[PDB]
Q: What sequence folds into this?
């Protein structure tokens, strides 16, 4: 409701909370009532005679604009403007429609360590196949090539001149000196050029196990015109079989210059690679995100878990299982492209702390996410409109700003511009000045006095002393003192004092209320600022908390097991904690630990359940309260008891939820006399 | 907040790599390494010795062996404060062979004088000395390249004796971990132990702990990182917050942690207790909007800087503001922890535009200015800076009035008197004191202090005005030493006060500026960042409650724990105290009730005219301000919250007394205290267990015996540990025939226990009829041995089995109508009921019985 | 019952006495010791210790360490003894300035150890007498009556205000009586 403290204007009233409204109708406030009685909640004001057409109630609203001349739009709407009131969320829908046939530019990086010899043999006979696979998805496609080994300095590479001449372990055949990054083939749609350029490559070697492919990726992403990128889908296949160096490894080689993230290509070679450190993963992710390049990690079996962690840092990336001879690569690109395209993320650029933004997802598979920090759901299908709900909440009366909501991996953007709604559309151009004694104007139903004149109707002058007659309205009752001793009576209304003690905000009609006199949780009034606020004896909390001191969360309580039942039916949830009855233990009232063995009696049901014995005592119905049977063995109290006839019957008695409700499994083999 | 930034001396040198490594030495000089500077042909690396007295520095002469080509001397440094020692290492020695080239390392140890220095797949690419420390036994050199870059460390006990410390190779998971990239020494009970960091372990990181168990070093704990590529373990720091001689926590930096708005992360890790696991508790962060700032690249101990006897640390962020760099300062807190927010941030851009990578190297814990205050050395690219701590000051102020209260004739309405000629006086005294201890002489520290005086602050019109200014405000500035000064000034009232119920209030608040010290390089003292800056005193009016007497009130306080006998800790979380206050005398002004309770009670609410209450601890409640009238009485309940892990003994006391502004002598009515018993909630269960014998049968024609065991399981499921007693009732004879001979009790947990056996007689003589009703052979119709076993310590959340074993015979069997007899044995747990109690409805599980059926 | 002395554990302890004379030893760890009534001998041992003497004439024995201690003797004439800092064995605390201990009862601290760049202090309140070490020391009194003993070495002693009793001991010592009616003993060696 409307926790208002001190309010004296329509804007001041609305700024005190999202539920406060302002009844403007004249002849509403009695002579003995103050102007703060207007700032109440809507139903209360409508109850006391105010109408629906004379309350102000500024309300946050959103209106969208779309480009009619723009065809084949993939993310709509384009521009949205908001009129935000603090404490009230504006919401609008953003629709994503997957388009068809977007060309592919695939760049290939391969390690040339000595273990990659067979892969090099297979890959250099593969350009036409990969181009054909690209064309089976879109009408136009181009392919490229690259290479990397490691930095040419110890301890990463042996710097002995003989070993720099031939770093391969075997001296028999051809092997090229180590290098950091070489750009081999420009992005082209010709297969013969791919065959000829790659066919000239020779294998290399180094000393360490990890390889410096992050330098190669940063150089690929930082030199757009040399690579040949066009404004289409950009892919980057990373084919390795080991780990990767990252920032900090260069100190072993006495290299402590951080990577600048700028192009350092001369004669298609990454010279100056021995004076810069490896990039950090954050730098690589930021560069790839800003250039819309989507990595595809084609790694061996033992490295899949290692490279899978990168996907939490780098969205729009995929990990594939690469064979030891690299024969399953093209199928890997197909699957990686399917996985990349099937998932959609919705995110916004950086915005200040005064604005909160939340996303809700609805899509084809039926999975719906609510109150998420970013939008995400899989199964995005072609020509299926998938909608996201964006909720924007302002915490203060903000100024004009703008932030962009974007679909990650695409150039299309949604621009959002925000306005405040901290203004009241009051009627003042035709108000009667006579009601203000001519010394003011009726704004929103209240009068504002000119210079010198004071009072609710401007009936007093500040230079004159307050009359003793008006002092009678400044006390609550015959025993209450004027303004409760914490204020001054001037022109018939109390004017409260201030206090040097922090948090001492004196308010109220008679200055009776105070801000620090409420229920205290852990020495803090209302559990501290993070749970609720004090309003002169009553504590009202922020959403998500309840109770006399806001110590109890409202929902999403811990009283529920994964099967979504409160305390397994063995207690009552009271302030996020189950109050178990009988001898059942916290937190979910599951186990009965000191509990007498129940297997003594439940043989009476077990005899008839799986041995076809009929009614003795009674039929096994309206008896056996809450006992059911399980076909498969159920983990629980293993038992063995004497049959009612003489044999040995052993059953395992699992416990389900409820009161005296179990699940039984009776064995069929019996030891008999 | 007390690190100097305007008078920082900068060392500049054109050698390459200058400022990469920095270390303080012997309280007067700082050593700086230049790893990449080319001294001569096939030589790389140089050392410099920079002095604060002169402000310049020259290289330290050192004869490099011819085999140490391109050794990169100065990449790592270490020092010892007492005795003075210096260790310098070059980890990049290019040993060139016929077919290969290897990267080994050398280290040089220096004594007090810098003139003579001793030289210190599998161990080939060792890079020994990459990070190094000095133990009391000798140098400690790490090898990041040992065993396929798994790591390790070499600990030298002599010039030619060393031991290798590393992990255990159960698998290849530790390959390429770079263990020994960072190193530290922990102290406890004057014995040293090692901490080693591996920032590349599984690409996530790892930090290790090593202890010498029976003369051999072994790893006893380790922690791990979370985010890939963050370098968890790339920098280590041991902190002793209380400075008692035992290390409390270890700071671990992850300079390459990635968030959308922050870069860098430092983790606080308290040391494990015994064999407990090592865990992280808090994480420190840099400022917002500084990605790739490399927060946590270098961090060192600064010692106590603010003078609160708690150790403080500094952390470096070389990558901030586009590689300009920054240095953060964190204060230590009680509880072996680090405060989560920084106290100062020094930015390189605010010092000089030429600074780059400011904060890449740090060193602190000594004084180099000879004024007794610790100093911090920060290394940058081509520069080394010296930041100096400053004296910390506090101010205490006191106000007195004379007379203490306004006289009646001053403010009474009168027509034959001169208006505005009232009088008064207020005395104001200020005292400036110093907190930090240092070597500067007395009388050098002077400060300029200005302050405000506000009469009736918070009131539109003040009742009293100063005589000299004729308004409610006054400004004055003056210079203070470390000595109290006093000043007095008259108070005047222009008109009568028609609301004498409110005292006149005086407010004071100040600002302090410290004058520089010319003898110690223009150092300026500063005010404490938490110093109180506002003070208030009250000036009450005289009372005339009746016939111009002194206002004589009579106050009485009583309270009672109504309908409550014992305070059960662990049961109900709150309890009431109904307290009543009476005023038999005339009007009471500013009535105040103060409570006193132990440390495990917290004030929750007050329910009942008006009652405002605020906080062995204490709380103060207000009784109907301003006035509590004549023949008045108030009754109210004060709620308390009792901690579930409270320790109040068996007897808790509450104390309360009443007070008022009239300030009259204390009386027995004014004071009251009452005492309440305490009990502790305990929950523990005893149950029969399945392996206990369920069935036995016999043939009367045969005389074979059998073994019987009744196994009980005892658990302390409660949150308390208490001494307990177990009693087993065992049927032994029936109509003078032995049933269960010489029964014995044995415990599975081999916990301490003592047992004593006693016999009790049956209550029913006619055993035949009793068997005829029910076929139970128990203590009602048989002789029972009562085995009582006493356990002095029954631990929390721990359990054991208690088997009761003995052999049987079947010569006591009665041929009743039923074809069976039951042998029942009961085990029930006792405790001192005067201290411990069971919760309602939970007492049914402290007893159990076990039955064994016998048929022919 | 009927026990006068107590020796603590190697861990943190809280030791309290009675109205009789007690000798309380804390050993290793951080200990809080209260002597209460009578004349007591308090030795905290290693670690950061807080020591109280309350009423009576108490004695505090300090050890060879750099860890600071807080000492409050309360009412009565109280003394602190620093003789165990220098011993024939090996000394852990540094004295690189060669000044033993430095005492200033007016400023309520004792510089128990001192490296070139690090100074270690003790907080001392309501203690009227100090006993030095075998090395040279600096002893400074306060406005009350103090008994200052230098023992061996070339010491300097300043009594401050009041009627003091200053002892020099063996070695060449500098004794200053300052204001009041003082009693000066030089001892062996050439003194002024
Ligand atoms: C830790 O150091 C020990 C030696 O102190 C290493 O043990 C050697 O390991 C190699 C590799 O398998 C074996 O060939 C040697 O026979 C081992 N020697 C001994 C004496 O055990 C051990 O590998 C190191 N652990 C790690 C993780 O590097
Ligand atoms: C390949 O690219 C060239 C360059 O423009 C173009 O002329 C040709 O049509 C392209 N071929 C295919 C099949 O797209
Ligand atoms: C592609 O987009 C970039 C965006 O900066 C633009 O400059 C360029 O003109 C576009 N077209 C081509 C062919 O690069
Ligand atoms: C040592 O460094 C110099 C620097 O130019 C270089 O020329 C020389 O080859 C290096 N020595 C070895 C053995 O690599
Ligand atoms: C005292 O506080 C006021 C504001 O509350 C401030 O304007 C004034 O400067 C302060 N006094 C001094 C001496 O700074
Ligand atoms: C009070 O008088 C002094 C001195 O005349 C003056 O500096 C100050 O501004 C005055 N204050 C007000 C509020 O007028
Ligand atoms: C006892 O305290 C509770 C607070 O939990 C309060 O609600 C109740 O009114 C009190 N009862 C009495 C008799 O004071
Ligand atoms: C109330 O009791 C406390 C107990 O510590 C005492 O300090 C205080 O002076 C007492 N006040 C009155 C008015 O009796
Ligand atoms: C005793 O019990 C065993 C167990 O089955 C059985 O084989 C035996 O026949 C029984 N003896 C008598 C005398 O009933
Ligand atoms: C108990 O009886 C069993 C079987 O009759 C026998 O094996 C065992 O030795 C006996 N033990 C004792 C202590 O009599
Ligand atoms: C013993 O057995 C009898 C017969 O069933 C039963 O009534 C009684 O409760 C049992 N316990 C005791 C202590 O007598
Ligand atoms: C008691 O015996 C059972 C036998 O099944 C065993 O599982 C359990 O661990 C024992 N209790 C304890 C505390 O070891
Ligand atoms: Ca391969
Ligand atoms: Ca410690
Ligand atoms: Ca501190
Ligand atoms: Ca200094
Ligand atoms: Ca005795
Ligand atoms: Ca101890
Ligand atoms: Ca004593
Ligand atoms: Ca001690
Ligand atoms: Ca001590
Ligand atoms: Ca004593
Ligand atoms: Ca004493
Ligand atoms: Ca004393
Ligand atoms: Ca001496
Ligand atoms: Ca003296
Ligand atoms: Ca002497
Ligand atoms: Ca004297
Ligand atoms: Ca004298
Ligand atoms: Ca002498
Ligand atoms: Ca002499």
A:
């Amino acid at each position: 409701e409307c926790t208002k403290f001190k309010v004296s204007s329509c804007r001041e009233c609305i700024e005190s909370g999202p539920g406060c409204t302002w009844c403007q109708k004249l002849n509403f406030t009695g002579p003995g009532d103050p102007d703060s009685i207007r700032c109440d909640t809507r139903p209360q004001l409508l109850m006391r005679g105010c109408a629906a057409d004379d309350i102000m109630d500024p309300t946050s609203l959103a209106e969208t604009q779309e480009d009619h001349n723009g065809g084949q739009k993939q993310l709509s709407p384009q521009k949205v403007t908001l009129y935000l009131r603090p404490g009230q969320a504006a919401a609008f829908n953003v629709t994503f429609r997957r388009a068809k046939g977007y060309p592919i530019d695939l760049y290939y990086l391969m390690d040339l360590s000595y273990s990659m010899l067979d892969d090099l043999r297979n890959v250099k006979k593969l350009g036409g196949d990969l181009l054909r696979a690209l064309n089976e998805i879109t009408e136009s496609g181009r392919i490229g090539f690259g290479s990397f080994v490691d930095k040419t300095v110890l301890p990463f590479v042996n710097t002995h001149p003989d070993k720099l001449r031939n770093p391969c372990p075997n001296k028999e055949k051809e092997c090229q000196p180590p290098f950091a990054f070489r750009h081999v083939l420009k992005l082209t749609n010709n297969s013969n050029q791919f065959q000829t350029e790659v066919g000239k490559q020779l294998i290399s070697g180094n000393l360490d196990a990890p390889e410096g492919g992050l330098d190669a990726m940063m150089q690929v992403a930082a030199c757009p015109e040399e690579i040949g990128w066009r404004n289409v889908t950009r892919l980057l296949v990373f084919a390795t079989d080991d780990g990767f160096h990252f920032a900090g490894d260069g100190k072993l080689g006495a290299i402590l210059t951080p990577n600048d993230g700028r192009c350092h290509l001369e004669d298609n070679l990454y010279k100056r690679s021995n004076e810069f450190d490896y990039p950090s993963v954050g730098q690589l992710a930021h560069k790839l995100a800003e250039n819309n390049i989507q990595p595809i990690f084609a790694v061996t079996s033992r490295m899949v878990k290692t490279y899978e962690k990168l996907t939490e840092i780098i969205p729009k990336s995929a990990v594939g299982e690469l064979s030891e001879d690299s024969s399953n690569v093209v199928h890997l690109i197909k699957n990686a492209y399917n996985k990349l395209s099937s998932r959609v993320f919705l995110d916004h650029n950086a915005l200040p702390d005064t604005l909160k933004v939340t996303y809700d997802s609805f899509c084809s598979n039926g999975v719906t996410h609510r109150n998420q920090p970013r939008g995400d759901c899989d199964g995005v299908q072609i020509n299926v409109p998938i909608t996201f709900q964006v909720k924007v909440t302002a915490t203060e009366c903000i100024q004009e700003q703008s932030f962009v909501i974007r679909a990650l991996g695409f150039t299309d953007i949604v621009t959002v511009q925000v306005l405040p709604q901290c203004e009241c559309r009051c009627r003042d151009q035709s108000r009667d000045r006579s009601l203000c004694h001519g010394k003011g104007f009726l704004e929103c139903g209240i009068c504002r006095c000119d210079t010198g004149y004071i009072g609710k109707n401007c009936e007093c002058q500040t230079q004159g002393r307050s009359s003793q007659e008006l002092e009678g309205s400044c006390r609550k009752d015959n025993n209450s003192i004027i303004c409760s001793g914490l204020g001054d009576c001037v022109c018939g209304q109390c004017l409260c004092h201030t206090s040097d003690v922090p948090g001492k905000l004196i308010y109220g009609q008679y200055c009776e209320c105070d801000t620090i006199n409420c229920e205290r949780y852990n020495g803090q009034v209302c559990g501290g600022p993070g749970r609720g606020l004090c309003f002169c004896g009553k504590c009202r909390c922020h959403p998500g908390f309840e109770g006399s001191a806001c110590q109890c969360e409202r929902t999403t309580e811990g009283c529920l097991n994964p099967r979504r039942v409160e305390c397994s039916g063995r207690g009552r949830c009271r302030c996020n904690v189950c109050e178990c009855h009988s001898g059942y233990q916290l937190p979910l009232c599951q186990e009965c630990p000191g509990c007498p063995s129940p297997c003594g009696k439940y043989i009476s049901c077990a005899e008839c359940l799986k041995f076809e014995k009929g009614p003795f005592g009674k039929n096994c119905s309206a008896a056996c309260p809450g006992l059911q049977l399980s076909n498969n063995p159920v983990k629980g109290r293993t038992c063995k008891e004497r049959d009612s006839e003489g044999c040995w019957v052993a059953y395992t008695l699992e416990q389900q939820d409820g009161m005296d409700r179990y699940l039984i499994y009776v064995d069929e083999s019996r030891e008999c006399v | 907040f007390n690190l100097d930034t305007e008078n920082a001396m900068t060392f500049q040198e054109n050698a390459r790599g200058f400022g990469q490594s920095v270390v303080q030495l012997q309280g007067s000089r700082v050593v700086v390494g230049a790893p990449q500077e080319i001294v001569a042909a096939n030589q790389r690396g140089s050392l410099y010795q920079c002095d604060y007295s002169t402000g310049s520095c020259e290289p330290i002469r050192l004869q490099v062996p011819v085999e140490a080509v391109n050794m990169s001397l100065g990449l790592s440094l270490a020092a010892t404060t007492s005795p003075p020692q210096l260790l310098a290492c070059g980890p990049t020695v290019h040993q060139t062979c016929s077919e290969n080239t290897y990267v080994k390392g050398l280290c040089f140890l220096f004594g007090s004088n810098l003139r003579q220095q001793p030289q210190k797949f599998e161990h080939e690419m060792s890079q020994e000395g990459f990070s190094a420390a000095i133990t009391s036994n000798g140098p400690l050199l790490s090898t990041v390249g040992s065993y396929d870059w798994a790591g390790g460390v070499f600990l030298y006990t002599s010039k030619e004796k060393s031991t290798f410390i590393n992990m255990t190779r159960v698998d290849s998971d530790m390959n390429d971990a770079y263990l020994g990239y960072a190193a530290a020494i922990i102290l406890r009970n004057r014995v040293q132990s090692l901490v080693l960091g591996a920032p590349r372990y599984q690409h996530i990181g790892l930090v290790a702990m090593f202890r010498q168990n029976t003369g051999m070093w072994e790893s006893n704990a380790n922690v791990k990182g979370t985010q890939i590529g963050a370098y968890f373990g790339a920098s280590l720091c041991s902190v002793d917050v209380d400075s008692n001689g035992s290390t409390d926590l270890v700071l671990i930096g992850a300079p390459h942690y990635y968030e959308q708005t922050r870069g860098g992360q430092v983790s606080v890790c308290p040391l494990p207790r015994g064999r407990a696991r090592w865990q992280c508790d808090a994480v420190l962060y840099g400022e917002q909007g500084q990605p790739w700032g490399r927060f946590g690249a270098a961090l060192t101990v600064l010692g106590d800087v603010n003078g609160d006897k708690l150790t403080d640390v500094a952390i470096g962020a070389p990558g901030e503001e586009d590689n300009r760099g920054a240095v953060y300062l964190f204060h230590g807190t009680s509880g072996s922890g680090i405060s989560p927010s920084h106290s100062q941030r020094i930015a390189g851009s605010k010092l000089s535009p030429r600074l780059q990578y400011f904060g890449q190297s740090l060193s602190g814990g000594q004084d180099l200015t000879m004024d007794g205050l610790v100093d911090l050395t920060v290394g940058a690219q081509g520069h080394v800076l010296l930041l100096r701590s400053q004296p910390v000051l506090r101010v205490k102020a006191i106000m007195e009035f004379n007379p203490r209260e306004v006289a009646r004739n001053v403010f009474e309405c009168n027509d034959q008197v001169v208006k505005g000629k009232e009088a008064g006086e207020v005395r104001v005294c200020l005292h400036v004191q110093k907190s930090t201890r240092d070597r500067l002489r007395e009388g050098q520290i002077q400060s300029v202090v200005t302050y405000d005086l506000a009469l009736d602050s918070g009131r539109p019109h003040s009742r009293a005005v100063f005589n000299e200014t004729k308004n409610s405000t006054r400004r004055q500035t003056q210079v203070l030493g470390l000595t109290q000064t006093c000043e007095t000034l008259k108070l005047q009232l222009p008109n009568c006060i028609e609301d004498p119920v409110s005292p006149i209030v005086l407010r004071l608040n100040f600002s302090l500026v410290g004058t520089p010290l010319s003898a110690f390089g223009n150092l300026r003292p500063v005010l404490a960042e938490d110093a109180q800056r506002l003070f208030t005193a009250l000036f009450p009016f005289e009372k005339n409650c009746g016939n111009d007497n002194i206002c004589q009130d009579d106050l009485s306080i009583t309270f009672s724990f109504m309908s409550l006998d014992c305070l059960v800790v662990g049961g109900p979380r709150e309890f009431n105290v109904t307290v009543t206050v009476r005023n038999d005398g005339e009007d009471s002004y500013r009535t105040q009730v103060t409570f006193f309770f132990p440390l495990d009670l917290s004030y929750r609410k007050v329910s009942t005219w008006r009652l405002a209450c605020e906080s062995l601890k204490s709380t103060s409640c207000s009784i109907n301000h301003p006035i509590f009238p004549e023949n008045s009485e108030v009754t109210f309940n004060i709620t308390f919250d009792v901690d579930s892990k409270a320790s109040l003994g068996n007897k808790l006391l509450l104390k309360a007394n009443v007070t008022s502004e009239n300030n009259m002598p204390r009386t027995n009515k004014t004071e009251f205290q009452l005492e309440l018993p305490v009990k502790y909630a305990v929950y523990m269960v005893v149950t029969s267990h399945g392996v206990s014998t369920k069935y036995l049968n016999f043939t009367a024609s045969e005389n074979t015996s059998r073994v019987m065991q009744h196994q009980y399981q005892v658990s302390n499921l409660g949150q308390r540990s208490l001494p307990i007693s177990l009693v087993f009732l065992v049927p032994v004879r029936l109509n003078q025939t032995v049933i269960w001979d010489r029964p014995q009790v044995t415990f599975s947990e081999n916990l301490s226990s003592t047992c004593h056996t006693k016999e009790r007689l049956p209550s029913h003589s006619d055993f035949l009829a009793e068997l005829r009703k029910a076929p139970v052979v128990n203590c009602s119709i048989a002789v029972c041995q009562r085995i009582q076993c006493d356990i002095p310590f029954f631990g929390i959340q721990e359990e054991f089995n208690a088997t009761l074993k003995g052999n049987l015979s079947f010569d006591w069997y009665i041929k009743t109508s039923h074809n069976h007899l039951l042998i029942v044995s009961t085990a029930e747990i006792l405790f001192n009921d005067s201290v411990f109690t069971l919760l309602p409805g939970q007492g049914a599980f402290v007893r159990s019985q076990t039955e064994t059926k016998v048929e022919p | 019952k009927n026990i006068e002395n107590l020796h603590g554990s190697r861990l943190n302890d809280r030791i309290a006495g009675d109205d009789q004379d007690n000798e309380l030893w804390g050993h290793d760890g951080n200990d809080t010791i209260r002597g209460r009534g009578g004349d007591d001998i308090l030795r905290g041992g290693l670690g950061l210790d807080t020591l109280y003497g309350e009423d009576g004439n108490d004695i505090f024995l300090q050890d060879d360490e750099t860890v600071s201690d807080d000492i409050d003797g309360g009412a009565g004439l109280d003394t602190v003894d620093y003789s165990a800092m220098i011993h024939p064995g090996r000394i852990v605390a540094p004295h690189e300035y060669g000044f033993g201990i430095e005492a200033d009862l007016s400023r309520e601290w004792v510089r128990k150890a001192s490296a070139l760049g690090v100074d270690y202090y003790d907080n001392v309140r309501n203690v009227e007498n100090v006993i030095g070490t075998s090395m040279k020391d600096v002893l400074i009194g306060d406005a009350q009556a103090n008994t200052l003993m230098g023992q061996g070495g070339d010491d300097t002693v300043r009594g401050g205000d009041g009627d003091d009793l200053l002892f020099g001991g063996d070695g060449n010592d500098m004794l200053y009586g300052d204001a009041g009616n003082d009693t000066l003993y030089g001892g062996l060696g050439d003194d002024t």
The pocket of calcium ion (ligand 18) is lined by residues C 8-9, 11, 13, 26-29, 31 (CB under 6 Å). The radius of gyration of chain A is 38 Å. The longest strand of chain A covers residues 386-394.
